Design a protein around this nucleic acid. Sequence first.
RNA 1: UUUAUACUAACAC
RNA 2: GUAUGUAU
Lengths: 151, 48, 714, 300
Amino acid sequence: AWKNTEDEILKAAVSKYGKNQWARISSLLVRKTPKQCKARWYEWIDPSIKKTEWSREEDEKLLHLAKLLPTQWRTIAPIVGRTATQCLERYQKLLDDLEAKEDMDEDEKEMLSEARARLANTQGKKAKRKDREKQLELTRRLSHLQKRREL
Amino acid sequence: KEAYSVKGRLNQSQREELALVEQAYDNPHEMLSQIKRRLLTMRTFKEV
Amino acid sequence: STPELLDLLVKCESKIQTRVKISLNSKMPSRFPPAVFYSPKELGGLGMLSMGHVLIPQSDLRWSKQTDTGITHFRSGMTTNGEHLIPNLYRYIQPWESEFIDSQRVWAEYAMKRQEALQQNRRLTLEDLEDSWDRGIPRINTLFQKDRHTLAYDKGWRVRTEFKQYQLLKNNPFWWTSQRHDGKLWQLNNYRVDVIQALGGVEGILEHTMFKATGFPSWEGLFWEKASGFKKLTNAQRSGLNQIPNRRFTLWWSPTINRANVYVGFQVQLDLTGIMMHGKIPTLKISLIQIFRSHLWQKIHESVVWDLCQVLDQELESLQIETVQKETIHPRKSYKMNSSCADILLLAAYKWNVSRPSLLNDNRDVLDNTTTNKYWIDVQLRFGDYDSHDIERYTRAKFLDYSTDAQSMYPSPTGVLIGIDLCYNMHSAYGNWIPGMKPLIQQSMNKIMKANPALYVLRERIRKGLQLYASEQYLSSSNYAELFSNQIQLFVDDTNVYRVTIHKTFEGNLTTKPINGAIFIFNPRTGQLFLKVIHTSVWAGQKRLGQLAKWKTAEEVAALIRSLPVEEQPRQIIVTRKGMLDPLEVHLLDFPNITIKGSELQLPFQAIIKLDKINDLILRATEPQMVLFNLYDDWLQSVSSYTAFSRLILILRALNVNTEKTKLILRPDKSIITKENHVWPNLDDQQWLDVEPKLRDLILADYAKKNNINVASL
Amino acid sequence: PTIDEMVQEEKLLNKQRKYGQNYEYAKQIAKDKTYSNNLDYLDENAGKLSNRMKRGDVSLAQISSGGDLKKINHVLDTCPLCLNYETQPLAPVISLSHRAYVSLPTQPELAKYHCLIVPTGHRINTLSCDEDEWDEIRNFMKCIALMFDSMNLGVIFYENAPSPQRYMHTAIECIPVSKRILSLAPAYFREALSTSDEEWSQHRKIIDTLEGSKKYGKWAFRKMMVKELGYFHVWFSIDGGYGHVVEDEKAWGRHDQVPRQVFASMLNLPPEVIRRKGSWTGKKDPREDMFRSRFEKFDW
RNA sequence: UUUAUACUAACAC
RNA sequence: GUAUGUAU
Ligand SMILES: [Zn+2]
């Protein structure tokens, strides 16, 4: 499916962790799996992809490599530059046709709040348990010092 | 099927496969239809 | 044919044993018993089939067996047999050349039969093919393979499976073949058999195990159970949890593993017990503790000594005993070994000329070899190795030790000691014997062994560990004479309780409704009944009511024994069906003295509802009623009991006989009028002998109708 | 403590098959938290790992029901047959015995006159049935057989209960097959049963009641085979049969196939019939009506 | 009286 | 609910 809600946490996720980790992200997405979470990134979401526009004169050489290789579509992508081999296959599927003719709302809001907790705090178990020890010791004194004034 | 009958534990992708496996058993002609379509059109495949 | 392969196949078979070998104990066994590895799975073995040659040592085939007439020793090696090595694998595999030669012969032989069948114009039969089953490299069994119509369209398979090794990372030894196209290319059947006989038969193996300690009747029909083994456990826990089944295996071979010849170790006694661990073997140390988990050792010693006092007080008049006194037991005497003070002291009124100590069970025993006037009893519990289960030699040493020893403070230098093993469930005594004592302690121990609660607890606790299930004496012709003794008994017949009449729905879907039924408890002395009538309503609005009703009957059978006074309570309850023992023993555990039996008889308690007054009254009965019937009228005035029991059993059978035309023979019998305050008719001694044959003739008619076969031998 | 008291504790456990000394051992490891899996450590603890039997209780209320309440009741509430006053089955049903009945199978269907005997009570393994209830099944067997004897056919029946932990009903199904194809079946199964499961098992593949019936024809199956654990069983005539006990059920077949694949070969059908799916539902007259009228002539 | 969260969990299947 | 530390 892949709706907007998904992608806007994913973009925030990669900024957080790094594109190397993927199963940390697919936990926070719930219904997505680190293969899809990674896969769907290299096709679409990232900045390096060129979503918009396709410039005719640069494009008549993109259908030229198909004459050379025939299939082989992943070696074509780094040359053609537009990448996202899906669209590089779909673009040559445009021009070859023309030549011849002539709960769910609620569950989305839950994951969107859980993600705001993950991004917010990095302290870990040791930070939380060490501060409680300070909080106990400080709170212990305030009762202990009142005993001294009482006496 | 051979792959997973032996193994005591199963993993995500295996869990995923067995459903698609079991779904195919139930109704073949619908799965046949999808196989033929997969050949004709598709040329780019997921990371192996 | 190579040496290089056959000096792996040894070293690698050893590498694998040494895996197991380690996971029981770290100090590494000097030797090990080979039964444990090579014995088939169905006797608690691993099943692992060897290449190379394993010299089974002779000392690991001896085994014992105990009847009440003695203890027979056996030697599988002493007899003139083939040299005792574990059989090789190769000798049960047709070497290729042969197979290849036979295959083309066989498949021609099939081409002969199959074409000559089509020349006859008559299809091929199973009879001819049984000649050649496990032959042909496509084995002919592959023709009868299920998927033959679908595998016909499979093709190029042999390549697939070679390549499959790149598809998934599971190293597959059967790659070169397939089981569906080539069939089983190997048969081991006759390997298993010939391994057993090399290990000393089922007995030779089973000796090594704790089969005897469980005390089941015979191996014949026994059982094994398979368990799996939630919370987040992590790593080190899941390893220990996968090795749960493994723990049992140690228990079942404990007798042959835990001995001096297997572990040249420090023999430390396990605490609170008489056992000895030779190694450390922690998997075994735990599961023995878990069995002797209260103070079970002490309690077995006391439970035996306590149930010797209760036999010797009743029969003291015959032995002419002055006083029977049980000594004060020290708390740790039960499981000490270097010392043992006597538990039961006795005296004699007259005199008692005995005999150099002998053995109990054995036939010929001498009676004039010594002279005394006193004796004592001291029981010794003893957990046996495989290397030492002879109690005869054990006790023998103990007397000769403790008799002449100056430190041991027995009263006289003349007495008796009883040896008892719990691992092999054996017993004997090398003491001073007398006419009267010999047959007493024979009978009394053989009862004690089968009777005691302490030894029954032990045997259940072991089976809890082994998880070894199975499939009092049953009723024979001798048990008929016993059931008409002075002892009160019962015949509980929960056949009746659940029945349904047929209801047809308006639509109407077929449906069932239940008709009140009688909890039939039949006395073998009084000849009365304790019928319980159960209302439909209890049945109503319930689920799984077939099993419920069986529980509901046993609840009210125990409630009837409570209502009966302590004088009139039964001694031995008997049930028709074997399934009834499970629910009934939960209520009768509060009354533990009663012996609950199972039977093999086809007792005729099916024909009871066929009496007309029982149908009329119970159909009318609108509440649960504790009714009391008499199935002997006042026969006791004229006809005796024993004979009348065989009569009404014959007459109850006889209402299932010509179904409802044996009762229809009793209806024109009007002169013999039935009494008004009683059930049966008033048949005289001649009319009993006229009723007997009529019913016996018609009975064997229905056995001829139902079971085909007419009249056979008596 | 006390011996007479201790005997009572042992018999109570005997009925509760789920909890014994293996669960107290397995519980103690999860509870221990610190547990290194060695021989050095397992000895240093020793007593600490066996110690338990304090929390165990319940007595009669536990055993009377058995196999949990929540699990069996959920099975019983859904169970699509079980004949009571309250509940009416989903199967159409033909002839009702006192503790059993004949009914038609699911929609895929193996043969034109394919049927199944079903006990009224929740029996599972047909070895757990009462000897009183079994006698009704025998009269059904002979009449059904004699029905197909006039058709010149004969019948092979079977039952498949690889897992009684699931706690399902057992339906002994009748399969009409010709006599020349019937005589081959002894081979087919004997291959399938030995092949199907891994052959390091203890129980030994194949257990013939056909030879046992010559020793005791009334009950060979009931005597030989065991109820408690898994199992599978075919038979020819009244009291013939081949018998195999199932282990590693995951390997066997969760949806019923090892036998159905053998009939899919022996009888020879398309590869779409092999798997049985669908439901009983109700009021399916046109197919089950043709069987009733035919069956009533031979049926007591 | 209803809903959520955590602690009770040194629970149970 | 211990492994491990804080207070009397
Ligand atoms: Zn049911």
